């Protein structure tokens, strides 16, 4: 409760706080965040991801411990924080979840599937099973892509 | 449902190219703007009383260093010292409600101001512990100067 | 290869990877089904959004003020209505043989579908009266959320 | 004030005579703050600059012993508190566990305030935890620094 995403915020971290509201300010928001290598931006509980076309170091297993079991509000925007909500709504509440990826090809949909399922492969407790189903899923992906 | 929209920043798959006109079409196709318009609807920011009081206890002389209990009353005397208009906020049952981020960035400005005063207080009492300690060691070596 | 061994009680987290919205210069029936599915997804998204928000403002006992948003339900209703939708007219023209063509189908859409505000055509009048440039013949406009 | 009973006059006089190296009868003006901080009053640097520019009209800061006593009876009522600085440390806790990062303590305490040097903040963390490294406590550290 002592930390917030408002501290050390590049641009405006959440677009509900963006003022004034048009597309012109929002393009500048994603511009000034993408320049400072901040590619995640929320709308409410919505993750906006921007493809950087390189491997960013924000996916370390060290940062998995940082992103785990903090609140949605308490930390800088990242995609794992969505999966860290969804999984706990599956775990502590026993309610079925679904994670929807919307966009066009070449914007990072398959990467977002890989990173969501990678976080779930990290924190589930039996990681080799999720890696075993995962490896045949990502293996079966170019088959369907044909 | 939990939700992700993906945006390409260019049509050329590069790391440092940002085409504003194409990203504008990416916002239009996904419709992020009406998403913001419906998430904002009445009050554009909100949080519980406890992280609000723990975040902004240093702006009120009745909450610094304590407390002021209960948390709704401490946020209230915080607003009454900081002279916030009544139409800027609303008291929920377990959350404080904020209408426009004008008040929010105002409070972030004031908290950003008092943060340097807190670090200045820490460095003052610490360096005073060092100079007082060196003075006590200097007395401990030479009784008269 | 990836399924469970037996049939037991379970709880599931799914991932729905769906494509995005389309605009070409020429948008055929494929892009029509595409953009219709994204109308449905946008509709359930805004509906669950408003129910979630109004749920919260009823929780914290705060008087709701009204917000203006784009109605997706009359675009969906403009397409899917079993008597007045677009797909009902298309299933009609496919069903009955009458030596049917594209311009006769546009004539039917001008007859029964142009009574709605957000449908837009050239030969009808109504919706819209105006002779708008970059609106050819043998085509129609739909005012989508995009 | 009135001012200043004798048991503080003797300490102000021995600390006043300690940092006199030219044989003048007054301290040097670069060391003006460490005179006040060696005795434990601890004014800030900018308020020291205003207080020394109040009595100086030459731009040097040269004072004598009764002017220094005047400055001590001004600041004598400004003795700080324990819970105030401790809650100021609790502002910098972001995790709510009582633990505090040493490297972020270096970033704050070398980028904010009077900007402690490398040996002072490195010595600060080495006095905070002798075992190390990179993550320290504060709740007994505040008891160590706030003794006169």
Which class for B114: exposed (0-12), middle (13-18), buried (19 or more C-beta within 10 A)? middle
* Rounded Cα gap, residues D30 and D46, in angstroms: 14
Chain B interface includes D65 (CB < 8 A): no
In this complex, the chains that touch C, judged by 3 or more CB pairs closer than 8 A, are A, B
Phi, psi of D6 (to 5 degrees): -65, -30
Of all helices (H) and strands (E), which one includes residue B6? strand B2-7
Q: Residue B31: which residues within 8 A CB-CB, separation 6 or more? A: C21, C42, C145, C146
Which class for B3: exposed (0-12), middle (13-18), buried (19 or more C-beta within 10 A)? buried
* Rounded Cα gap, residues A11 and D72, in angstroms: 46
Using CB atoms, which residue from C20, C49, C50 is nearest to B30? C20
* Contact (CB<8Å) D95/A3: yes
Q: What is the CATH number of the domain that holds B60?
A: 1.20.5.4820
Tokens at residue A14, please? 């959440």
* Rounded Cα gap, residues D60 and D51, in angstroms: 13
Beta bridge mates, C13: A97
Q: How far is C38 from chain B (nearest CA, A)?
A: 9
Q: Which residue of D has its CA nearest to B133?
A: D38
Closest CA to C121 of C112, C34, C109: C109
Give D-chain residues touching A1 at CB under 8 angstroms: 96
Return the DSSP state at A37.
T
CB-CB contact of D108 with B119 (8 Å): yes
Q: Which residue of A has its CA nearest to D95?
A: A2
Chain D interface includes A8 (CB < 8 A): no
Residues constituting chain B: 145
Give the D window 109-138 contacts with B, CB below 8 Å: 109, 112-116, 120, 124
Closest CA to B126 of D109, C89, D135: D109
* Rounded Cα gap, residues B115 and B58, in angstroms: 9
Q: Which residue of C has its CA nearest to B36?
A: C69
Of all helices (H) and strands (E), which one includes residue C92? helix C86-95
Q: Which residue of A has its CA nearest to C18?
A: A102
Tokens at residue B88, please? 């800027």
Task: Locate all alpha helices (DSSP H) within chain B, ordered by sequence.
Answer: 20-30, 32-39, 49-55, 71-81, 101-141
First to last CA, chain C: 40
* Rounded Cα gap, residues A108 and A113, in angstroms: 9
**Helix/strand/coil (H/E/C) assignment for every residue in chain D:** CCCCCHHHHHHHHHHHHHCCCCCCCCCCCCCHHHHHHHCCCCCCHHHHHHHHHHHCCCCCCCCCHHHHHHHHHHHHHHCCCHHHHHHHHHHHCCCCCCEEEHHHHHHHHHHCCCCCCHHHHHHHHHHHCCCCCCEEECCCHHHHHCCC
Q: Residue B111: which residues within 8 A CB-CB, separation 6 or more? A: B55, B56, B58, B59
Handedness of CA B95, B96, B102, B103 (dihedral sign): negative
A126 is in an annotated binding site: no
Q: What is the CATH number of the domain that holds D23?
A: 1.10.238.10
Return the DSSP state at B46.
E
B79: containing domain: 45-141
D18: containing domain: 6-75
Of all helices (H) and strands (E), which one includes residue A99? strand A97-103
CB-CB contact of A57 with A76 (8 Å): no
Method used experimentally: cryo-EM
Give C-chain residues touching A102 at CB under 8 angstroms: 18, 20, 38, 41
Q: How far is B133 from chain D (nearest CA, A)?
A: 8
Closest CA to C126 of C135, C134, C116: C116
* Rounded Cα gap, residues B145 and B135, in angstroms: 12
Chain D interface includes A2 (CB < 8 A): yes
Cis peptide before C128 (omega within 30 of 0): yes
Phi, psi of A101 (to 5 degrees): -115, 120
Tokens at residue A56, please? 């960013």
Angstrom resolution of this structure: 3.9
Beta bridge mates, D101: D135
Phi-psi group of B83: left, alpha or beta (phi > 0 → left; psi -120 to 50 → alpha; rest → beta) = left
Closest CA to B124 of D28, D31, D145, D50: D145
CB-CB contact of C67 with C54 (8 Å): no
Return the DSSP state at A48.
E
Give C-chain residues touching B94 at CB under 8 angstroms: 60
Residue burial A42-78, b: 16+ Cβ < 10 Å; e: rest:
bbbebbbbbbbbeeeebbeeeeeeebbeeeebbbbbb
Give C-chain residues touching A103 at CB under 8 angstroms: 19-20
Closest CA to D27 of D55, D72, D68, D73: D68
* Rounded Cα gap, residues D30 and D52, in angstroms: 12
Using CB atoms, which residue from A96, A113, A133 is nearest to C15? A113
CB-CB contact of B99 with B43 (8 Å): yes
CB-CB contact of C121 with C141 (8 Å): yes
Q: How far is D103 from chain B (nearest CA, A)?
A: 15
């Amino acid at each position: 409760v002592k930390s917030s995403l408002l501290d050390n915020m590049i641009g405006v971290g959440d677009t509900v706080l963006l003022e004034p509201l048009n597309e012109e300010t929002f393009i500048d928001n994603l511009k000034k965040r993408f320049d400072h290598n901040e590619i995640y931006t929320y709308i409410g509980s919505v993750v906006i991801s921007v493809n950087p076309y390189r491997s960013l170091p924000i996916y370390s297993p060290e940062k998995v411990e940082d992103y785990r079991n903090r609140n949605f509000y308490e930390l800088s925007p990242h995609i794992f924080a969505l999966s860290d909500e969804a999984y706990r709504s599956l775990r502590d509440q026993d309610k079925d979840q679904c994670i929807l990826i919307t966009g066009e090809s070449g914007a990072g949909k398959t990467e977002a599937s890989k990173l969501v399922m990678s976080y779930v492969a990290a924190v589930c407790g039996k990681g080799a099973e999720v890696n075993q189903v995962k490896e045949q899923l990502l293996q079966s992906t170019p088959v369907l892509e044909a | 449902p939990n939700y992700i929209r993906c945006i390409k920043p260019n049509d050329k798959k590069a790391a440092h190219i940002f085409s504003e006109s194409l990203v504008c079409h990416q916002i239009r196709y996904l419709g992020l703007l009406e998403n913001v318009r419906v998430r904002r609807a009445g009050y554009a920011f909100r949080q519980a009383y406890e992280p609000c009081l723990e975040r902004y206890k240093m702006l009120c002389k009745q909450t610094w260093p304590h407390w002021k209990g209960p948390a709704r009353s401490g946020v209230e005397v915080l607003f009454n010292e900081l002279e916030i208009p009544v139409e800027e906020y609303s008291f929920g049952r377990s959350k404080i409600f904020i209408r426009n981020p004008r008040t929010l960035f105002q409070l972030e400005d004031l908290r950003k101001q008092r943060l340097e005063d807190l670090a200045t207080l820490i460095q003052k009492i610490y360096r005073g512990w060092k100079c007082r300690t060196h003075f006590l060691l200097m007395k401990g070596l030479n009784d008269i100067f | 290869s990836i399924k469970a061994q037996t049939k037991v009680r379970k709880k599931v987290m799914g991932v729905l990877d769906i494509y995005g919205f389309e605009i070409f210069e020429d948008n055929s029936f494929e892009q029509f089904i595409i953009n219709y599915c994204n109308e449905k997804l946008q509709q359930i998204f805004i509906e669950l959004t408003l129910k979630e928000e109004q749920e919260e403002y009823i929780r914290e006992d705060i008087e709701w003020t009204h917000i203006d948003y784009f109605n997706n339900a009359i675009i969906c209703d403009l397409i899917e209505n079993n008597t007045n939708g677009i797909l009902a007219m298309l299933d009609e023209e496919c069903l009955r043989p009458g030596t049917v063509t594209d311009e006769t189908f546009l004539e039917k859409l001008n007859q029964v579908c142009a009574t709605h505000q957000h449908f837009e055509s050239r030969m009808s009048k109504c919706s819209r009266f105006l002779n708008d440039t970059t609106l050819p013949h043998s085509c129609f406009r739909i005012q989508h959320y995009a | 004030a009135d001012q200043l009973t004798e048991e503080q006059i003797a300490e102000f006089k021995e600390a006043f005579s300690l940092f006199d190296k030219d044989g003048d009868g007054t301290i040097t003006t670069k060391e003006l703050g460490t005179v006040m901080r060696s005795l434990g009053q601890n004014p800030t640097e900018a308020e020291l600059q205003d207080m020394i520019n109040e009595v100086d009209a030459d731009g040097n800061g040269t004072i004598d012993f009764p002017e220094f006593l005047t400055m001590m009876a001004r600041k004598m009522k400004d003795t700080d508190s324990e819970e105030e600085i401790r809650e100021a440390f609790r502002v910098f806790d972001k995790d709510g566990n009582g633990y505090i990062s040493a490297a972020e303590l270096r970033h704050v305490m070398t980028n904010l305030g009077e900007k402690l040097t490398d040996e002072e903040v490195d010595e600060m963390i080495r006095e905070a935890d002798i075992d190390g490294d990179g993550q320290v406590n504060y709740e007994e550290f505040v008891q160590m620094m706030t003794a006169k």
